[PDB]
Amino acid sequence: RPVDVSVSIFINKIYGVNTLEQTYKVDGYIVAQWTGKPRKTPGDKPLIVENTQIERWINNGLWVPALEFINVVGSPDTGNKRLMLFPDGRVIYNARFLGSFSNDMDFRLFPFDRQQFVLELEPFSYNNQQLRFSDIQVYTENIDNEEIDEWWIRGKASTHISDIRYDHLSSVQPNQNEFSRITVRIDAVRNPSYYLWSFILPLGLIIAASWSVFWLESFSERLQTSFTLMLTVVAYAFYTSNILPRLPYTTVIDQMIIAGYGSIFAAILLIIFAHHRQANGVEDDLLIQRCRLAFPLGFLAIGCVLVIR
Amino acid sequence: RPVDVSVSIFINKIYGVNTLEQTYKVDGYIVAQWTGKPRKTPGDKPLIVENTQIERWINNGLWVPALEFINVVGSPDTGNKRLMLFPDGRVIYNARFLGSFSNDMDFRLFPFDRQQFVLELEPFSYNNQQLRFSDIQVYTENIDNEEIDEWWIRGKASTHISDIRYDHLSSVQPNQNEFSRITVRIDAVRNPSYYLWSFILPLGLIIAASWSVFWLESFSERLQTSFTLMLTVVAYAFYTSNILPRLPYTTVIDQMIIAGYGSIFAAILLIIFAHHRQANGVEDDLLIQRCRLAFPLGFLAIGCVLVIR
Amino acid sequence: RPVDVSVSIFINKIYGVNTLEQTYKVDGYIVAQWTGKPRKTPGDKPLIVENTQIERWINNGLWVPALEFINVVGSPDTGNKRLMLFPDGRVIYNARFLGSFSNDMDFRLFPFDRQQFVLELEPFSYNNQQLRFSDIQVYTENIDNEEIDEWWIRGKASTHISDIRYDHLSSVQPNQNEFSRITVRIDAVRNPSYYLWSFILPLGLIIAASWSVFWLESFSERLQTSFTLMLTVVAYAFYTSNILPRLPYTTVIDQMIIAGYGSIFAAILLIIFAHHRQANGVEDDLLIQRCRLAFPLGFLAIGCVLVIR
Amino acid sequence: RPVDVSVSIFINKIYGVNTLEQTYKVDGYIVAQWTGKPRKTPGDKPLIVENTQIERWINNGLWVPALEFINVVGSPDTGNKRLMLFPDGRVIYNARFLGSFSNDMDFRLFPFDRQQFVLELEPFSYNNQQLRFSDIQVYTENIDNEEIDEWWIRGKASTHISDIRYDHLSSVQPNQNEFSRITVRIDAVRNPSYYLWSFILPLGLIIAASWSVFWLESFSERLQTSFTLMLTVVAYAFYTSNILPRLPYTTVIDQMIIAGYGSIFAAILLIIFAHHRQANGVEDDLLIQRCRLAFPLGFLAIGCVLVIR
Amino acid sequence: RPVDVSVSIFINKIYGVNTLEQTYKVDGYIVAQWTGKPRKTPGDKPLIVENTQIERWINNGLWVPALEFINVVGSPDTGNKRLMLFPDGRVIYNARFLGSFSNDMDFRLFPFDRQQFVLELEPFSYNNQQLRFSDIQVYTENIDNEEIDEWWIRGKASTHISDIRYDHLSSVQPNQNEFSRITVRIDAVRNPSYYLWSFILPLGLIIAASWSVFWLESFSERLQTSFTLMLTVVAYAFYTSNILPRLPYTTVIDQMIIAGYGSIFAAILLIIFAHHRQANGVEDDLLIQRCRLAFPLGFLAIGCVLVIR
Ligand SMILES: FC(F)O[C@H](Cl)C(F)(F)F
Ligand SMILES: FC(F)O[C@H](Cl)C(F)(F)F
């Protein structure tokens, strides 16, 4: 009884990832084929009907079922539409689309995160007793200059036809609560280049150079210098937060920034301590100088357990 | 007399809060059912009508009442529409929507505020003598990976059907000025982590280290250094406000920053005072040094009394 | 001869003021009533025509005059539309709207400016010999928690029906060049809190704290420090300008900042003068110390005459 | 033989300059009048046709010619449309429009530049053998409050009917390649206020105070203080560039900033030389102190040749 | 057998480059001519059909094939449309368009990069056995004032009609799988003005002036100062990243900045090394002093081998 419909999805561009909304944009084509009652066509050649003329065939009673992108956000932008009506009954729908799609996206390991861009397709009104997906093919371009793209695609796309039970239905009962759903999956990793060299590396240089406060020889010099070091980190928090993507949680880099604040406050506490540690009011220069390698090691050790994943 | 309408709202995503506009975005489905004139459908099976075709049926005289989201801002983005016409009279309207919705939103306890996401639904043209809401069912996903979600939902959705009296109507009088309204409410509280670690904590470290001005030995060091501390708070206000949400009032973090300006201004007023209080021109080291715990307590005491709620 | 139209405007939300564009957003309903040729309606009860069906009634010749928002900017977004057709001839038009509206807006007294949001309504094609507004009622919500709102509405809306002479018409002559116009005005003053506590006060503190340069004891100390203060004001100007609204003129806050630049430049000029005013190259400590209360009065005096209004 | 069309353009608001795109936004009405086949109208009075009805008349063979805004960028937002059909043949088209329009715009003299806003109107399909503009009238409001406006309109609009030869036409030969084009011109100058007081003045003051490096007596004091000044110019470059419009070339303020970097770098090169010029290792106090008025002249003279215009 | 289509493309504006999306905006006209069955026109003169009337011609069966912009991003904004119907069979389609177009864009040599603005045009439904492009003409305006443009167009458009094999088809087999494609290319280079004078040059001045650290005579003076130089580079990093285009990779300016960080961290290491290299604490004034020209050469060399091309 149910109509077998064959879907092919062509993907042109995956771009414009929004971290805060957890969406991404996909431009592509959708093709759908099914077979119905045969037809008289002009010539024994297939009939092509475009755009606004498709609507006319729907009014004369042509069955063209609505297929919904389950995870699109807002009505997709539809370009050219096409129906190909064959005399032997079969019907092919072809359309270009650009839409914004939603998926769960975890950005905590930024900039070393992996994301998967998902498309989910399901007929809007017809259950699997009426319309079912027979098979699904997905085509992706071979990116050859992937080194200049924001995202690197990792392996060809995954497909999976399945059936979805809607419990809470305002319809009827017997086996009429399941729908045929295509799910396309594409794995991807973030191009970590820019952030290593322009963010991680100079943040490192800055935090290390902070440790050299202990190679200053006065107390006055060490305390006062660290206030400049403090200012530098605040400025660095500002540089990063303004350019990196906004998120509701802390990233790896955000954690480094917080660490930098800590190492400088810690140093302020030791610098101020060695000035009073011992009797005589003598500067326990045993404590400093040990600090010239206590911090570059201490921070780097208890900071070497950032296995938070 | 009145037609009973049964509503189901499936909610897919609540995202995009706009602090200054006091709005939020909701992706979902709305279903509405009523019973009308019984009907002849092809086969004794229900008839499905999609998209542009609902309109044709509206014209041959099918009643599909406009149900308005009373607190939406702008015409919502409607995806696919579906009418399901039953032979025994029933009609089910099904449509997808993306909309920006409005509610009073108090963000004064940011980042520790709680908000409720509200939907208000009301027929546009017909009163409760003509159309009444029989019941409202709201379906929401249960988010468990709420830790990468900005908001924690505090229970399944609460509802309230009621009747609204419009004083100023230009229509008629006897009992025809009341409208049936569905109101959906979803409570949620904000996940404060990010703001705790990346905004509250380092502001604390900065404000704390501010106090270490009193451990400087000359007056010169004490006064000149506090100007750098002042610069540091300004640099921090810039960092926060460039990234934190815009509001017409002060939040907690806004006040901590103001406190920082104050603690540094007080310190300058004291640093300069302890230098000229006594005869002999001798540095009143009595006033200083006591400040080394006067401030870290005074602020921490006069700051543990911000019971403004 | 002319048709009487009765208008009601319900205002839901006034938000999104754009300072450079001098526009603001308004969500609301517009109701318009007039009486025409009596009609047979199904049952002697009024007939409801919604949305796309209004169009069909216009094509068969129902007179529904377009009312134009004179000061809207861009075609407004119309929500649900309704015609209610009475058997005794009268016709009521109901539509939801969201639009961007223009008005002269002076932001020179920011953040203590007063604005009035105006709506101006006028028929697009019919002159007062053809269509005139009989009366205008405006209803506004009573916001009770206005302390969480950016703008405080100050009083109920004022209204005014009047007549407009268009001189340059390519039309006809006898009394045919005047149009009936509704004008709505809603007064408002800005919520000054956030800007006082988070912008004005710390700028005041910082400007004052700058005066403490004269209490440093070296010439070297006094001059070198002024450069740090100069930087603090540049940074503060940046902070305010990045957050406050864009304007083609200076506000009070813009002016305080200029004064900050000035008081610091003045001090540099004196500090550098006191080092060479007198013979011996001796630091003229007579001039200094006297400045320690001269500026906090001097700036505080010639700055207390910014009655530029 | 060709149809004479009389055009009137009313201009309501000119706003929203986009400097990088070289566009501006224009709100107004366009009126267009011509004469055709006389007509039977209901009553011997003129017939009014609004909005959606204009299309219906076009299907019965009414000629309503497309008049295109040639320098518009993307289809304008057309508000209400109106046709006024007179019984004696004449036809008037009246429409409200908001559009983004393009013109060559030179921002090199910012914030003291003068610009002219242009509208170019031309029929889309009919050449001057078929349709020609008889005349063009342009009306603008008389602005009295220009001090609160970003732009000062300087004089009434000038108008210009002419003809355009499109050489490469795929049509025929004799004279069917010329089209009549209206060109409206409105001159305007920028309100320089905000940029004078909040950008030019303090940059000068900063640059002035930068010269006061030479009144410090040690070399150490002079060199170290030079790094703070350098930072202040970087801070200032950031402040302006965040607020000023983006351009692909430098402005006066951009130049002042580059000049500021130079005067600071220049002083650094001398300060470092005077410490090592002569034998004895003597801080050549002959060179400095003489610089206390050499630079404020040297810069201010070699700065008197930024006559790039 | 197949129909010949003649295309002419007029290009008005190429603006609004989006670096992250790798797209650009194009305003223009598209003209397409082909010949069909001769026709009765009113008079033996060509027939003009504008805008909404084209659809009526389509329903009665006029063949107007959809030509798709293959590398557009989203459905283009189409202005006025026109059909010119000649009696001797030929047909002309004329339309104005605004669209965002996609191409591979390498921004690594910023601000000295060259780009190609590409349009790829292809029929949506008909293969080359049915419809083919005979010839293609591209017309572009001649810019004389390029000194005020963001982009410099470098040479006229190059053209190339070609044929594309689509592998994955659900149709038939013999020779039905190739399509006719127009590809337009326009080369352009960026106006480097603003970036040389207001970005590159002061970076040089700033990076160079960092080298003047080695001319300080104290160790204290040298180390404490290098922390101020550090602050200056982060602040400059902020200035650049806020105004330069966002990209996923490093530019030459980005690399200088990193180099800027390096030269200062190196400097901190030598300054701190020269203080403890030798016995007794004798300050190795040979290492310093040699550095007074060691860095200005080393950096200027290891940054002069950023010939990565
Ligand atoms: F604060 C400034 F005035 O001086 C420089 Cl930046 C610092 F920070 F090192 F002290
Ligand atoms: F310098 C920057 F890194 O930070 C801001 Cl600009 C300053 F200067 F105020 F500290």
Residue numbers in the entry:
A (entry chain E), B (entry chain D), C (entry chain C), D (entry chain B), E (entry chain A): 10 to 318
Structure paper excerpt:
In this study, we co-crystalized ELIC with the general anesthetic isoflurane, which is known to inhibit mammalian neuronal and muscle nAChRs3132 and GLIC33. The crystal structures of ELIC-isoflurane were determined with resolutions of 3.0 Å and 3.4 Å in the absence and presence of agonists, corresponding to the presumed resting and desensitized states of ELIC, respectively. As a homolog to eukaryotic pLGICs, ELIC shares similar pharmacological profiles of eukaryotic cation-conducting pLGICs with respect to modulation by general anesthetics. Thus, isoflurane inhibition via a direct pore-binding mechanism is likely accomplished jointly by stabilizing the closed channel conformation and blocking the open channel.
For ELIC crystallized with isoflurane but without an agonist (presumed in the resting state), the FO-FC omit electron density map shows strong electron densities for double isoflurane occupancies inside the pore near residues T237(6′) and A244(13′). Nearly equal electron densities observed at the two sites suggest that isoflurane has similar binding affinities to both sites. Isoflurane at the 6′ position can form hydrogen bonds with the hydroxyl group of T237 in addition to hydrophobic contacts with L240 at the 9′ position, while isoflurane binding at the 13′ position is dominated by hydrophobic interactions with the side chain of L240. Over the course of the MD simulations of the resting ELIC, isoflurane remained near the same two sites (6′ and 13′) as revealed in the crystal structure. Isoflurane movement perpendicular to the channel axis was largely confined within 2 Å of the pore radius in two replicated simulations, indicating stable binding in the closed pore. The RMSF decreased in the closed ELIC bound stably with isoflurane compared to the RMSF of the apo ELIC. An open pore-blocking mechanism, however, cannot completely describe the isoflurane inhibition of ELIC since isoflurane also occupies the pore of ELIC in the resting state. Furthermore, isoflurane binding to the resting pore stabilizes a closed channel conformation. Although T237(6′) and A244(13′) have different side-chain volumes (T = 120 Å3 vs. A = 90 Å3), the tilting of the TM2 helix makes the pore radii at the 6′ and 13′ positions nearly the same (∼3 Å). The binding site at 6′ consists of side chains of all five T237(6′) and two L240(9′) residues that form a favorable amphipathic environment to stabilize isoflurane binding through amphipathic interactions.
